[PDB]
From a paper:
Here, we identify an evolutionarily conserved hexapeptide sequence as the major aggregation-prone region (APR) of gastrointestinal peptides of the glucagon family: xFxxWL. We determine nine polymorphic crystal structures of the APR segments of glucagon-like peptides 1 and 2, and exendin and its derivatives. We propose that the pH-dependent changes of the protonation states of glutamate/aspartate residues of APRs initiate switching between the amyloid and the folded, monomeric forms of the hormones. Our results highlight the dual role of short aggregation core motifs in reversible amyloid formation and receptor binding.
Two polymorphic crystal forms could be grown from solutions of APRex-4. In the case of polymorph A, side chains presented an unusually high degree of flexibility. Side chains of Phe2 and the partially disordered side chain of Trp5 assembled into an aromatic cluster near the solvent channel and chain termini. The hydrophobic core is formed by Leu1 and Leu6 while intrasheet H-bonds of Glu-Glu side chains stabilize the interface. The weak residual electron density around the side chains of Trp5 suggests that additional conformers of this side chain are also present in the otherwise close-packed crystals. Tryptophan of [name] (polymorph A) adopts different conformational states, (opaque and transparent side chains) having multiple geometries of aromatic interactions. An aromatic cluster is formed in both polymorphs of APRex-4. However, the exact geometry of the cluster in polymorph A is ambiguous due to the elevated internal mobility of the Trp side chain. At pHs where Glu/Asp side chains become protonated, charge frustration ceases as side chains establish intersheet H-bonds. For example, protonated Glu forms H-bond either with the opposing Glu (S1 of polymorph A, S3 of Polymorph B in APRex-4 Fig. 6c), or with the indole rings of Trp(s) (S2 of Polymorph B Fig. 4e). In the presence of organic solvents, the exendin-like structures adopted more compact crystal forms, in which opposing side chains of the steric zippers interact with each other.
Residue numbers in the entry: 1 to 6
The structure:
């Protein structure tokens, strides 16, 4: 599981 916010 991977999550990124930028």
């Amino acid at each position: 599981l991977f999550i990124e916010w930028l």
